[PDB]
Symmetry: D2
Subunit: 257 residues, 4 copies
Amino acid sequence: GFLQGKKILITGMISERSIAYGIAKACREQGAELAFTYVVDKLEERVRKMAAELDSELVFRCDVASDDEINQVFADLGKHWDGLDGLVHSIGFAPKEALSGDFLDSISREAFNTAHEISAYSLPALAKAARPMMRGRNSAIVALSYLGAVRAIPNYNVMGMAKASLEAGIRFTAACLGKEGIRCNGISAGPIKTLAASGIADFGKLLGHVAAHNPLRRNVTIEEVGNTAAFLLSDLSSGITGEITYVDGGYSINALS
Amino acid sequence: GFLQGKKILITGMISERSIAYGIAKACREQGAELAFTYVVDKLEERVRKMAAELDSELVFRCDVASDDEINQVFADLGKHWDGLDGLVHSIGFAPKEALSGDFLDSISREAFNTAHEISAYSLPALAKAARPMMRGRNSAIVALSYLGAVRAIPNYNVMGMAKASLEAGIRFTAACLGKEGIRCNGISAGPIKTLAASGIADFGKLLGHVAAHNPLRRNVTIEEVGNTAAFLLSDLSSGITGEITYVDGGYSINALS
Amino acid sequence: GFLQGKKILITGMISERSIAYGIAKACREQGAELAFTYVVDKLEERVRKMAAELDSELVFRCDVASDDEINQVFADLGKHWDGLDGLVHSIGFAPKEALSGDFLDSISREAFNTAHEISAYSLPALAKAARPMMRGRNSAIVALSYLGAVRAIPNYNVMGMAKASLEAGIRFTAACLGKEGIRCNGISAGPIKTLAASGIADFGKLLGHVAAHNPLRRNVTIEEVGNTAAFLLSDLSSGITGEITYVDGGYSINALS
Amino acid sequence: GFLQGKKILITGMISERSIAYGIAKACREQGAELAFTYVVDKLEERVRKMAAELDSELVFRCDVASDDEINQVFADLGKHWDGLDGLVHSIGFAPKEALSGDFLDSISREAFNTAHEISAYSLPALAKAARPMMRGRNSAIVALSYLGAVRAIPNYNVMGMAKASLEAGIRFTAACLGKEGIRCNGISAGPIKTLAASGIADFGKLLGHVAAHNPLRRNVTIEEVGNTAAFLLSDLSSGITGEITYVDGGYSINALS
Ligand SMILES: NC(=O)c1ccc[n+]([C@@H]2O[C@H](COP(=O)([O-])OP(=O)(O)OC[C@H]3O[C@@H](n4cnc5c(N)ncnc54)[C@H](O)[C@@H]3O)[C@@H](O)[C@H]2O)c1
Ligand SMILES: NC(=O)c1ccc[n+]([C@@H]2O[C@H](COP(=O)([O-])OP(=O)(O)OC[C@H]3O[C@@H](n4cnc5c(N)ncnc54)[C@H](O)[C@@H]3O)[C@@H](O)[C@H]2O)c1
Ligand SMILES: NC(=O)c1ccc[n+]([C@@H]2O[C@H](COP(=O)([O-])OP(=O)(O)OC[C@H]3O[C@@H](n4cnc5c(N)ncnc54)[C@H](O)[C@@H]3O)[C@@H](O)[C@H]2O)c1
Ligand SMILES: NC(=O)c1ccc[n+]([C@@H]2O[C@H](COP(=O)([O-])OP(=O)(O)OC[C@H]3O[C@@H](n4cnc5c(N)ncnc54)[C@H](O)[C@@H]3O)[C@@H](O)[C@H]2O)c1
Ligand SMILES: Oc1cc(Cl)ccc1Oc1ccc(Cl)cc1Cl
Ligand SMILES: Oc1cc(Cl)ccc1Oc1ccc(Cl)cc1Cl
Ligand SMILES: Oc1cc(Cl)ccc1Oc1ccc(Cl)cc1Cl
Ligand SMILES: Oc1cc(Cl)ccc1Oc1ccc(Cl)cc1Cl
């Protein structure tokens, strides 16, 4: 197992459809020891149960809107773990009304701020809070992004701006932390039916177009995303930092198919 | 000239060193009629005086932190102009402390929020507010970005995340408005000594490195940026939308020089 | 006219549908003086006639397969002109059989070599031969490329590899010549029905998909490409080198529309 | 390991410094069965000896200048293996004189043709020749590229054009073969002292600049490149095709460091 001895904190696992669940399962299959966060109290039981199936009893509340909660996660986790080898950012949010229809009609200052704070700022915020536990460990951060960072896409709207901010965040974090032995990389995943995906108007059509038009002629799975994250969290990828890797069956590199 | 009679609103002109001044002068040279905004009352006289030299008496206060002020500009401008042919976004802000030293140490939630709101959200906010005046005119929007959008750069820090958000904003705005006959493009300018540039720690060294390492072996001018904006505002560029054009003397495409 | 006093050599003009014709017409409208090349003797009369309508009697044979013919163009042109301010590369070739159907089935060593030699090597070959006439003149080179450089596209096949080589050629030429006052830029044009376009199997479908899916919801014109080339050949673009500018109505920056 | 029983053909292994050696060792560590090619008879013994240390007695001559030799490899290999799961392209060549000094002065038609034929065409040529043995196996191809594909770099010169062609080749091969269950990906490696590296004028300074300026503040190893190739050859990367992955310690995403 190529993550033997790695201790990895995973955000964003709320169901077995979650990308973070695929990541968790892939990492555990490679021998990682896991810990998890959940955004609100209502989810605690569900997440503890999934964590238990993945051999973990380390679960912490963390709304990334809160610097106090972010910092408290690492304080609490630090009582159990000497250091942190892996950090998975698999979280995003924007108000549903901002992800439907005309980009300018649907945008607002408040939706823009929320989308960026939760979807983009949270990466440097978590990296910063994790830094004492991660530095010097030859450790790694993986964050999830989407093609909307670099292409205009119907309905994704302000989340595209937030993902672009996130990808730049990945690059700046990588440049910041590389000398102290922390890597930071992104996965730009193709569409996958998850709980959050239903917030994007006409998600079913995005999903269908990609399967019809990508080189693989099918959509990717949370196992495929998960195995890629596991690689990027492992010492196998020690030469790679500041990279965005596309796990979309080649969709982004194809045109007019 | 190739903007003869075109009516263009320009943000961000605060001195004769401003990129927006170079844009203004370039547009006026091609026959455009201009109007201007200024962030606070303390600048009104200075901006009115520059505007007068460019044959304009149309000057409006606009802090892009304020949706009221943004929308009031177009209400007031609309008393003079029956439509708007061009809109120039040449504005940015982040707290100076966030643009000095280690990326994660210098970042904060509040600095992130400010940087994104003023530097990135302001593009769709202005596009949205201008839309009734611009649509159906084969009109155009130009916004100013920087390499920090797509590369990690020392000291630019959180402004890089904001510029990435901005460039995605340009793409989404272009996709949104293209059917209505409004284009939206970006210029990624090389470093230029402007008032805002002094907010970046060690800007003088950044400026020097580019001149020593780009294909042209010199920095670009506000006239060069300005002429590019004039082109992108004109019907000559009617086949171009959602584009980021580098006016950095080739710096971005060079390595190891 | 922003090309007043500019002397520009244009390759590739074989009919009034040619991209090079749109370039020629756009440049002449801005006051440029023109000269032209043609690949074989059979075309001489047709090209001389088009050149005459554009106020030029300077027409030279040039098969870019031949170093002797390339060099002879500048020797001959140098009898009339003191220097050369603009050079337009608007030429490409690959055997038709290599641009139909399965990429690997259709490729061959010989087709690959031809495609690259004529479509890609010709840019540095012409730049190199033109260099004595262009250096120190604040002059400029523009070459035409296509999205196949950076995306896989059905049927374009080995021409995509040649266009990628070309775009790198543009970057290396820009880096090479920038200090001596020669710029080199590319235009990646959207699909346009030209003589050469019929060599691509199912070109009509490419053309239709782009018009249905790009931000402008229409294809671009040779006037739009031409006006962009005119800008890139003019002193207005003096801050820009090594750049690929997309004149495809935003097609490349849109996805899933 | 994650390549257990997978049969992988590796080109380009000429010494223990070779990138292909790092790939070979990484694949063998994950359980792969290997076979190898060598360019000329003079190398046969050296390569057989390295192959033996990696538990292989399958070694074949292959100068990729020769379509006969390329196709003969798979005919001969096919006597031992009923199919092929992995193919590694780790080969390049250009005349040394073309990789020294001014790009245009050093280039020639013949050097361009050689560089592209050996460095770029060889990827689709090998993919094409391997296709009967690879299809239907959920198999994979990996090829090695360099930053010169997408940035101008001193002295790398015409090899940059060839690498750009190669990367497009990777994209087109991926699009071509995806339905048949063959993936094709690239690794853009940072500088590593190998035999071929000495062909680049002033390679030692290039190597030094990267270590001084990348996020990791060091150069990558053939083990790091190798482990990445092993991942891209394995079913773990089944969601990834047509991708270029940077294993350069973040060099490409950094600027002005
Ligand atoms: N599903 C896809 O097609 C897809 C494609 C590309 C990228 N992504 C990205 O993958 C990541 C995971 O999304 P997913 O599709 O697995 O959806 P998901 O709904 O399974 O997970 C989204 C997670 O974000 C968390 N979250 C939201 N607001 C939060 C806050 N304030 N604090 C902490 N956590 C918060 C949610 O609780 C949830 O666990 C996201 O970044 C998403 O943008 C998804
Ligand atoms: N100077 C450079 O090297 C350079 C390079 C690339 C991009 N840019 C970008 O060019 C644009 C113009 O900056 P410049 O360098 O000409 O500097 P400048 O200081 O002349 O202009 C910056 C402008 O931003 C305006 N601004 C700041 N906060 C504002 C607010 N809340 N509301 C409205 N306006 C506000 C300022 O009043 C000022 O007019 C910016 O987007 C900057 O990021 C500059
Ligand atoms: N039409 C399009 O949709 C489109 C889109 C993007 C890029 N381009 C590019 O635009 C450029 C011009 O093509 P076009 O579409 O106007 O077609 P065109 O047929 O009008 O021009 C192609 C030209 O290439 C010339 N040529 C071919 N082999 C030559 C040789 N050995 N020596 C000298 N000249 C030679 C032809 O004689 C012809 O003049 C090409 O580089 C093409 O790849 C075209
Ligand atoms: N070393 C680096 O810094 C570096 C960085 C990025 C990419 N690369 C690429 O990695 C690959 C491997 O090179 P390396 O650096 O390991 O050097 P190397 O010298 O160990 O390997 C180069 C190989 O190319 C083979 N080759 C050359 N001409 C050939 C022909 N006609 N037919 C068949 N094989 C031929 C050589 O025999 C040799 O085995 C190349 O594609 C190179 O461009 C190298
Ligand atoms: O980023 C995503 C991209 C896709 Cl294709 C599908 C789901 C995604 O994830 C989200 C989408 C919308 C919201 Cl409000 C929150 C999240 Cl996490
Ligand atoms: O974005 C920029 C990039 C450069 Cl190289 C120089 C100046 C720039 O403009 C700014 C820099 C810092 C702040 Cl706080 C505000 C602005 Cl407008
Ligand atoms: O590059 C092109 C791209 C497009 Cl969409 C249309 C035409 C193009 O130009 C060519 C296509 C094929 C051949 Cl054989 C030669 C040339 Cl010049
Ligand atoms: O592509 C490369 C890039 C780097 Cl930084 C180092 C070595 C490389 O490999 C080569 C360099 C020159 C020649 Cl002639 C052949 C090969 Cl294989």
